[PDB]
Amino acid sequence: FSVDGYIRRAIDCGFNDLSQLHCSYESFDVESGVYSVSSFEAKPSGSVVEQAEGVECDFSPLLSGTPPQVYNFKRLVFTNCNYNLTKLLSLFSVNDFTCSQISPAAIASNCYSSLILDYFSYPLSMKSDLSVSSAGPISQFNYKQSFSNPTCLILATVPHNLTTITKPLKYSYINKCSRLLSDDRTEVPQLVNANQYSPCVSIVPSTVWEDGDYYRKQLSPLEGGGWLVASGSTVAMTEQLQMGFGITVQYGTDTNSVCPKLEFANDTKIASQLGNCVEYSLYGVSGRGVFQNCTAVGVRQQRFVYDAYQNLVGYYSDDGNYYCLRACVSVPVSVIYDKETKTHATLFGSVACEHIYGPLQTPVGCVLGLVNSSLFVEDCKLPLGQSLCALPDTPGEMRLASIA
């Protein structure tokens, strides 16, 4: 920016390595020297994908008979299957579908180790009682979602023509659950744990007969003694049954085999892209790398082989082969710059020139912009390493000189 504010000169900081240098010092004039700059990135040339492909995950149970009350929720656990939430959501009039610790787009598109679906009858009038922040009876004694795993909650109404789902007489819930200790002075509220059933489930009937019913069980000594007690409550039934569906997903306890179905192209196979840098998604595991055919190590049944820094370093494919996985590797870059001549050369340290006058292979890497001179110096200003030096022609190209 000039004094009058106009821009008269600029550097595109991603144009080349010399430009990166000027930008890092925020100046158009930097001192002579050899500087490290951002590496020349390897970029993906394609992608490989492997997903479980097969059986649909089965939501049929959900659709047949009278759903349980909130404290007796039923659980469907899906593993090794193709999921489709639209397939289930489309059967209900959804009133409220929200997600936590997972985006909306993600819930319907990511692969999981497992998907757990908890379904139950639930009045919509008590919607708020399922909130994480709630201190009412549902969240304290009946049903609580995980705080650790990503979850979604769907509240939906059963359509008049979905005749396979029947209604209970009333909606019901536990409004009290507690233990009376052996002294019969102290009463301890028994709160429901996330993803678990309340201890009072065994004393509370599948339908509370009437609001205010009190239940009691004498506990054995192995259960700590005393009494387990509970109180039920009811909500009048609606014209259409309202149901809640909790969804909990886990991301890495097993192969993430619960995936949306995918139509596979045969150009996304690993064997067809060996040696290339590709993006990968293997049963929910993703990143970038290069696959190589190699000797199997690790336990085959476990599929993914990790190193001591927890990187994925190998994989057993469903095509029967074991592949080594290497990172797409970046190519080191150092800029050799001479301020007086306004010239430069690029050193790719540690890199053979097969990956890059043409390029010159030197003891410290491959260098472009230098010409081999078979000349010696003592007075080296731009040392390259080992006993090599860049020597400006003064302008011409820099010479590669040896230090005497």
Partner: protein, 137 residues
């Protein structure tokens, strides 16, 4: 390489410029340290080392074999990973890591680079060899 991250990284100021400049200076410091140290070991005048140097005093241990015998032994007995200054990039692809926690191959993965020293081995050997020949005189 993730753009969202880079976008957030920018809000921390010129963080990476500081990292690079601090290391650049720290690295120049060794080239200057080495240059100064060797300038001082350097002899003005020296006698040639010939087999038999030392007379009745057995100095074959120190005579260049070129590094001396003790010098090669010192290096052979120390476990040092090979940084691959000329083609390490490729060694780590065609062979892969030597072992668990291979910090040389980690360079191309993690984003760091080990730079070569200011002088090659034969030059350093030349300095101490000329030094040996200068001692008596």
């Amino acid at each position: 390489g993730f753009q969202k991250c880079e976008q957030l990284l920018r809000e921390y100021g010129q963080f990476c410029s500081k990292i690079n400049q601090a290391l650049h200076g720290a690295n120049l410091r060794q080239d200057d340290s080495v240059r100064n140290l060797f300038a001082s070991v350097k002899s003005s005048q020296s006698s040639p080392i010939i087999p038999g140097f030392g007379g009745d005093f057995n100095l074959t241990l120190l005579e260049p074999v070129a590094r001396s015998a003790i010098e090669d032994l010192l290096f052979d007995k120390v476990t040092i990973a090979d940084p691959g200054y000329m083609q390490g990039y490729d060694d780590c692809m065609q062979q892969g890591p030597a072992s668990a926690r291979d910090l040389i191959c980690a360079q191309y993965v993690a984003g760091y680079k080990v730079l070569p020293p200011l002088m090659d081995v034969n030059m350093e050997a030349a300095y101490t060899s000329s030094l040996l020949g200068s001692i008596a005189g």
